[PDB]
């Protein structure tokens, strides 16, 4: 029963291993093994549930174990394993073949097979752990082993993509352990984790690997947000080491998602408004990407309210995600109408929902945006309006309070008006008629630049996928 | 962890405080290099001081400032001022790089000065600091018994 179960899944694993083994042996091809590893995550996740855990036991017995003898026993100890007589030395799939990792030349140490075998061995370990959701000692045991192993290897061009997906599980398993239980050792463990990310990122700068630095920057920028150091994130993004060429669309959307949150506290919403929009277009619309589109759209609605301009309300009702957008619907209504008591009562009941995403602190500063937007609305109504009539519509305190708020927004060019005290009304200084000025000409220049940029980007990849058609013999 | 408390002690006058504050930066680098770039003018100010004898450790950290930012032009100059503070046998990511970067600067400066005179290696025209680090890798190749890289690097 259990004998035929281990031979079926192991044969499917070796079949996928021999495909990427011959591709890296001849010259250097990094494109083909990368496309297979994309589907490997989905095929292995479903396969780990079937045929239990016994598919990975004979794989370690097959190939030679540099470090991997005692690591599988520690993984099988937590599950209280019953003895099936799985002791190594029973099943032998090598049988002295060149593609089978010939044993005599391997045992004599005349050839080194450990490079591709050991780096691939650590990949299947983190996949089974993420399926069973194992924590505590098993998480710390892997972090201690992997770090010296990556420092010993020279990390060639093909070797940089093997551990590129392993760093994601290092930071993921550390955050799930802290949120599950808080202790004194969780803080000291994060100190070493910060130094490990920076040492490997600096080494990857010489190799100039596109996917390696893409996964690290996404994990490092998120670490600064949890640890709460802004000065580290400000200088980190100033170097601009993130390549835009071969990185995946899923990795690009995560990059622009962090820049919108960093610039949110810098009081510059001009550049932050573009990063949150570009992150939506780069993120897929599929079901697995719904988790990112849910959090990204919650930030976009908050940025527009911080800009003093009411965004388009059609995004809430037309989308199918409005169930989670209900708290943000009443926030825009309170800022637009300018009701003072409605805004205070909205953030009070929904404070629990806004605590998880940490957007409640930004809602505290929306209290100012309620009045600043209302002043902009009433200013665009009538060019000449009395001073005391403003306090009657918004139910303000006195005329001395509104006098400062109108002259406050004109510093950034918001209201664009003047207050006449001797006359008794506030006259708007905006006559429009910009058709005679040069201001629209500056915007028209940047629009054509976007056209010539896409034309050059159209030339980036055109003939490239067709380059292999001429060299390969056709009919 | 911020570099402000460790770099704030360099503005006073003491023998032990300047030493303890400087050695703390050499231990923790990859974490604190964000705020060190802004304090770099305060670090390079002690290098020109003749009464400051720790400049070997100060220039070693100042070399890591541009080394972490991607600029290898100034990272080689300040690294040579470390003298015994820079270990050849450490074989770390910083040692195996700056030494390799000094080899590239040795080739570019030799070919440009070869047309004027062929004796530049004997005279003082060439930087003698780049020559000392260049001969250390020569003896390193002799221990591995390789005559291709030993005679090939001098060509």
């Amino acid at each position: 029963l259990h004998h035929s179960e281990k031979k079926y899944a192991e044969e499917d694993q070796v079949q996928e291993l021999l495909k990427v083994l011959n591709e890296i042996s001849k010259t250097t091809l990094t494109l083909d093994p990368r496309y297979i590893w994309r589907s490997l995550k989905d095929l292995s996740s479903l396969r780990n549930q079937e045929l239990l855990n016994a598919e990975t036991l004979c794989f370690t017995v097959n190939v030679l174990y540099p470090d991997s003898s005692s690591f599988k026993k520690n993984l099988l100890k937590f599950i209280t394993s019953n003895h099936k007589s799985s002791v190594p030395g029973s099943a032998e799939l090598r049988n002295s073949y060149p593609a089978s990792f010939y044993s005599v030349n391997t045992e004599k140490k005349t050839i080194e097979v450990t490079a591709e075998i050991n780096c691939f061995m650590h990949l299947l370990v983190q996949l089974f752990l993420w399926d069973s959701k194992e924590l505590e000692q098993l998480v710390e045991f892997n972090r201690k082993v992997v770090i010296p192993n990556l420092l010993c290897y020279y990390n060639l061009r093909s070797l940089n993509l093997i551990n590129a997906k392993l760093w994601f599980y290092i930071y993921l398993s550390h955050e799930t352990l802290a949120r599950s239980s808080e202790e004194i050792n969780s803080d000291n463990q994060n100190i070493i984790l910060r130094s490990t990310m920076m040492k490997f990122l600096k080494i990857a700068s010489l190799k100039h690997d596109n996917e390696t630095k893409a996964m690290l920057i996404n994990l490092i920028l998120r670490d600064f947000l949890n640890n709460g150091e802004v000065d580290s994130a400000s200088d980190f993004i100033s170097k601009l080491e993130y390549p835009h060429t071969d990185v995946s669309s899923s990795l690009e959307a995560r990059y622009f998602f962090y820049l919108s949150k960093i610039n949110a506290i810098q009081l510059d919403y001009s550049t932050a408004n573009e990063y949150i929009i570009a992150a939506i277009r780069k993120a897929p619309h599929n079901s697995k990407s719904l988790g990112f589109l849910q959090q990204s759209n919650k930030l976009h609605c908050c940025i527009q309210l911080l800009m003093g301009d009411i965004p388009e309300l059609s995004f809430f009702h037309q989308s199918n995600m409005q169930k989670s957008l209900l708290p943000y619907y009443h926030l825009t209504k309170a800022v637009k109408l300018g009701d003072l008591k409605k805004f205070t009562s909205t953030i009070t009941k929904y404070k629990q929902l806004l605590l998880k995403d940490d957007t409640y602190q930004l809602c505290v500063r929306l209290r100012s945006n309620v009045i600043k937007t209302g002043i902009r609305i009433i200013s665009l109504t009538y060019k000449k309006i009395s001073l005391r009539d403003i306090c009657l519509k918004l139910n303000l305190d006195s005329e001395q309070t509104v006098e400062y708020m109108v002259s406050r927004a004109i510093r950034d060019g918001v209201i664009e008006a003047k207050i006449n005290h001797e006359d008794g009304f506030i006259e708007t200084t905006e006559l429009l008629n910009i058709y005679d000025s040069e201001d629209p000409q500056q915007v028209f220049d940047e629009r054509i630049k976007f056209a010539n940029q896409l034309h050059d980007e159209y030339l980036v990849s055109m003939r490239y996928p067709e380059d292999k058609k001429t060299q390969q013999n056709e009919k | 962890t911020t570099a402000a408390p460790l770099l704030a002690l360099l503005r006073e006058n003491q023998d032990s405080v300047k030493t303890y504050a400087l050695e703390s930066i050499n231990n923790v680098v990859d974490q604190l290099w964000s705020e060190i770039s802004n304090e770099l003018p305060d670090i390079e100010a002690l290098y020109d001081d003749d009464t400051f004898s720790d400049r070997e450790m100060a220039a070693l950290i100042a070399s890591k400032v541009y080394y972490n930012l991607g600029e290898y032009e100034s990272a080689v100059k300040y690294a040579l001022a470390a003298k015994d503070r820079f270990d050849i046998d450490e074989k770390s990511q910083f040692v195996e790089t700056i030494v390799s970067k000094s080899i590239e600067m040795y080739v570019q400066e030799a070919s440009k000065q070869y047309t004027k005179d062929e004796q530049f290696y004997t005279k003082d025209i060439i930087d003698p600091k780049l020559t000392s680090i260049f001969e250390r890798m020569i003896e390193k190749c002799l221990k591995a018994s390789e005559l291709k890289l030993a005679l090939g690097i001098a060509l």
């Binding site: 061009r157 010489l206 190799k207 100039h208 055109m462 003939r463 490239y464 067709e466 380059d467 001429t470 | 790089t97 390799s100 970067k101 080899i103 590239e104």
Partner: peptide
Amino acid sequence: EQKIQETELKIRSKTENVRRLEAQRNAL
């Protein structure tokens, strides 16, 4: 081999500047 490893990017970089322009030149 610090200089050789840094120039390895030019292997596929110069290849795209030839094979791509070769088809556009031959078709023209």
